[PDB]
Amino acid sequence: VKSCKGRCFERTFGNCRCDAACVELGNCCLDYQETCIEPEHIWTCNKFRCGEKRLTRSLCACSDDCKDKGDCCINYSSVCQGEKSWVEEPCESINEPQCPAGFETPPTLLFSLDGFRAEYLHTWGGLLPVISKLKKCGTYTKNMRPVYPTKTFPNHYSIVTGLYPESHGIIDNKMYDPKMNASFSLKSKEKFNPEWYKGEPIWVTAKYQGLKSGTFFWPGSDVEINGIFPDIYKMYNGSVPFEERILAVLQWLQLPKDERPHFYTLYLEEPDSSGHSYGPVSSEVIKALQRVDGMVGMLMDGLKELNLHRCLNLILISDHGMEQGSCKKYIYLNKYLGDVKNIKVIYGPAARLRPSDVPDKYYSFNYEGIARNLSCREPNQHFKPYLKHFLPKRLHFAKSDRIEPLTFYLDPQWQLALNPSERKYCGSGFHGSDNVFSNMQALFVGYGPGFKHGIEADTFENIEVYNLMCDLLNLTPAPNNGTHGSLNHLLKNPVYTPKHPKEVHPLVQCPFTRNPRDNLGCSCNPSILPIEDFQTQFNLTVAEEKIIKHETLPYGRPRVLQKENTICLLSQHQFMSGYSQDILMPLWTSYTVDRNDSFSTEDFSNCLYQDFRIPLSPVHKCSFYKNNTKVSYGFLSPPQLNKNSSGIYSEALLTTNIVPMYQSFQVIWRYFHDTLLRKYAEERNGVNVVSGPVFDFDYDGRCDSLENLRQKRRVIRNQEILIPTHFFIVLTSCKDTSQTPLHCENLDTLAFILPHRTDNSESCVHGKHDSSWVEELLMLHRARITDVEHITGLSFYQQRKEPVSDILKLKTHLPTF
Ligand SMILES: *[C@@H]1O[C@H](CO)[C@@H](O[C@@H]2O[C@H](CO)[C@@H](O[C@@H]3O[C@H](CO)[C@@H](O)[C@H](O[C@@H]4O[C@H](CO)[C@@H](O)[C@H](O)[C@@H]4O)[C@@H]3O)[C@H](O)[C@H]2NC(C)=O)[C@H](O)[C@H]1NC(C)=O
Ligand SMILES: *[C@@H]1O[C@H](CO)[C@@H](O[C@@H]2O[C@H](CO)[C@@H](O[C@H]3O[C@H](CO)[C@@H](O)[C@H](O)[C@@H]3O)[C@H](O)[C@H]2NC(C)=O)[C@H](O)[C@H]1NC(C)=O
Ligand SMILES: *[C@@H]1O[C@H](CO)[C@@H](O[C@@H]2O[C@H](CO)[C@@H](O)[C@H](O)[C@H]2NC(C)=O)[C@H](O)[C@H]1NC(C)=O
Ligand SMILES: COc1ccc2c(Oc3ccc(NS(N)(=O)=O)cc3)ccnc2c1
Ligand SMILES: *[C@@H]1O[C@H](CO)[C@@H](O)[C@H](O)[C@H]1NC(C)=O
Ligand SMILES: *[C@@H]1O[C@H](CO)[C@@H](O)[C@H](O)[C@H]1NC(C)=O
Ligand SMILES: [Zn+2]
Ligand SMILES: [Zn+2]
């Protein structure tokens, strides 16, 4: 008499009412809403609904017959039969997958929570029980590094292609292509134009190898790519409630095996939506995090009902993080340029500049002009104009013609526009900043038979996930920017065992040739002890060679993977090197600074000794460089480093150990070898060094072919000289500072690809100590060893006893401080 249970919408006499008219009269039963109305709007059972008379308008049922008719709400068993929800069960390991026929290869589901920054789980884990249990029972990283720019379409498409945006063509949510003379927008018909989307998304990879795919939203999944759609896909519609998306995927997993997909996707707009609207630290973001946690729980409860919770490989992921924007942390360019109307500026933290008159002036326009106009205009300026090829190589943001030739690099929390009118609310949450900023780091949790249990992996990049998903589905990956095997440590049973790459040609021989001691035009410091008998000093016993090889190449010599190359090994007492006769320059030197080594202050300028192992060339003579305004030279292995004396190491002054070097770059190079290298050596109990030139004239992150290098030589004093685009450095010590670089159990690495520029305008030098700015520039231009490998065509560490996959893990690491 006091409850609507069983009598929804039936007229009553005397009892509280359960008809629509009761509301206005205020004589409804206490439970009228929960019993009769709520079921039309919710996907959950509760203590009011358990044993309900079936309602015709209810989204799912909590009636006694719901199991038989198979339309129970997902939480029915937990709430109405007192069984445990997935999250309530303790972790148990999934060694053998428990799958139906059709799933001999188990399915993989890629579940994106847009704008879920890694920090949300660090801080709010206690409010997020389901995601917290997936972490506890699964494979987790505190930080997954997204691609630059840290935006939705770029990162989602990178996750399913393993490609940098510069290569997959989706470089932002808004772009212009000058060859197509079209603009890309998420609100335009151009979003569906196949021409934008390059590479091979995993659902295409899967199709070619006999697996069907089912996407409930993913950037690109509603587009015909290489003539292919997913076998099941949805036209984007953000209004579709999360519950309906999850329920649909659970229907696809019940398809008969002939039509049932193996690869699934799920995309939710939260907590990105709430992040923008209310900021990453807000009541709205907390409620949004609890909601997506509940939705993940709904999937797991759903998989459990289907007995697929020990079958399906789930990758819970996000595209990027979220930062608090501020109207006080917004740069407007009109302050420096005036209210000009000939330029269009892409606003945000990944701001870019382009002429209005396109495609006509797209290449011809004076980018360099505005670049110089906007450099070092204030002290502690919060932005930096960069021609795209001068951006740090770690950002891999230049190759595409869709990347405007002038870009801006913004400090954390800072954004940029032309003027206040051409942006949105400045106080909103935002993302797009440098992919190494803490608040831009993303979520990754892997749970299922394929994944290890209770593992916390070191930080990895989302471009590695394509290969991982391919391994989980026994697919052969399309060519991508991931290092295949670098994530084998996440997998119970790795399917791909990587091998170190084999070098194409063997080392050529550079033998001693008797030739006349020639004048090089050098005014050598009298301090330096010249090389009196070369043939004597460099005819080494195999006993003596083995001592040097062990001290300078403790990890093995760099191997050269280039097609056409003639490299030869040069021994010296303190360093080894690979010399290119084809470019008259070493491709790499290797030496080791010990904790108790000496660095000389004695001048060694305009001093060189002839190396009788290679033909003498005009560009190897002090005379070529004497009062030369266009280029100078520098040494790879540092002459300042003496082990046997307290003077200058004479063997380092050989013509074979010099590289063309702009006078402005010498400031950086000197500071590194005089100050920093000594400090590193002390702090780490020694440091092995490998340094060399880099030639990336195509600014594509790859070493240029020898064919291409011929046409890139400059003419200076009627000599053909090849000037490096960058210089690389790779420092290697031990994790354990009790050990020296020659006897490490575990390698601690730190690599740089320093840009080789005619000025130091990048660093805004004037009125600041030399000390500060050089370390700041090194930090900004750090790189993975894998980045160095791709851009030099070298391969390091091939003599380490570690398995290959462990070395790939080490080479793909990027140091964060
Ligand atoms: C990330 O991974 C990417 C995929 O592996 C990789 O990009 C590939 O780069 C190579 C070389 O730049 C591209 O391969 C072709 O190589 C020749 C060079 O001789 C190009 O000329 C050729 O272009 C073409 O032009 C022809 C016109 O006559 C035509 O017949 C061809 O069909 C073709 O259009 C190729 O471009 C390859 O396409 C790239 N793939 C993609 C998807 O971008 C990146 O280098 C790698 N990034 C890093 C930093 O490692
Ligand atoms: C995008 O997804 C939206 C949410 O799924 C969807 O909106 C919803 O569309 C349904 C259509 O059934 C509306 O229901 C209306 O139509 C039925 C059919 O007879 C009648 O009961 C009523 O006239 C009812 O108003 C929902 O009201 C509506 N839901 C919401 C929250 O707006 C869109 O249709 C989807 N598609 C596109 C392309 O926009
Ligand atoms: C490149 O695209 C631009 C912009 O769409 C084109 O410019 C337009 O030209 C038409 C022809 O009279 C006019 O509608 C307008 O002057 C422009 N339209 C807009 C929307 O700005 C241009 O024709 C295209 N082609 C080339 C190669 O320049
Ligand atoms: C079906 O393929 C897709 C998947 C996602 C798409 C998308 O995802 C987004 C949604 C909303 C915001 N804006 S937000 N999260 O602030 O409200 C951004 C990206 C935008 C446009 N098309 C898509 C097609
Ligand atoms: C920068 O260019 C603007 C025009 O866009 C000009 O008015 C201004 O004087 C320039 N500022 C310099 C050169 O510092
Ligand atoms: C030329 O080089 C010498 C030292 O070799 C240097 O002291 C001098 O400044 C330079 N001369 C000119 C013309 O700049
Ligand atoms: Zn996003
Ligand atoms: Zn966003």
Numbering used by the authors: 105 to 921
Sentences from the paper on this structure:
Ectonucleotide pyrophosphatase/phosphodiesterase 1 (ENPP1) is an emerging therapeutic target in human cancers owing to its role in degrading cyclic GMP-AMP (cGAMP), an agonist of the stimulator of interferon genes (STING). Ectonucleotide pyrophosphatase/phosphodiesterase 1 (ENPP1), also known as PC-1, is found as a secreted protein in the extracellular matrix and as a membrane-bound protein intracellularly and on the cell surface. ENPP1 has a role in purin­ergic signalling through the hydrolysis of nucleotide triphosphates (NTPs) and cyclic nucleotides (cNMPs) to their corresponding nucleotide monophosphates (NMPs). Apart from viral poxins, ENPP1 is the only known hydrolase of cyclic GMP-AMP (cGAMP), which is a second messenger generated by cyclic GMP-AMP synthase (cGAS) as an innate immune-system response to double-stranded DNA in the cytosol.
ADU-S100 is a STING agonist that is currently in clinical trials, while QPS2 and Ex54 are published ENPP1 inhibitors. The fused rings of QPS2 and Ex54 occupy the same region as the adenine of AMP but extend further into the pocket, displacing the waters that hydrogen-bond to N6 of AMP. The quin(az)oline projects deeper into the pocket than the adenine ring, making additional interactions with Phe321, Pro323, Asp326 and Tyr371. In the AMP-bound structure, two water molecules are hydrogen-bonded to the N6 position. These are displaced in the QPS2-bound and Ex54-bound structures, and a hydrogen bond between the 7-methoxy group and Trp322 is introduced (3.0–3.2 Å). The methoxy moiety also appears in close contact with the carbonyl of Trp322 (2.4–2.8 Å), which may offset the affinity gains from the introduced hydrogen bond. Ex54 and QPS2 extend out of the adenine pocket via benzene and piperidine rings, respectively, which occupy a similar space to that of the ribose ring of AMP. The sulfamide groups of QPS2/Ex54 do not project towards the zinc site (as per the phosphate of AMP), but instead form hydrogen bonds to Glu373, Asp376 and Ser377. The sulfamide of Ex54 is flipped in the B protomer, projecting towards the bound phosphate, and therefore does not make the above inter­actions. The sulfamide moieties of these inhibitors do not seem to make strong interactions in the catalytic site, unlike the phosphate of AMP.
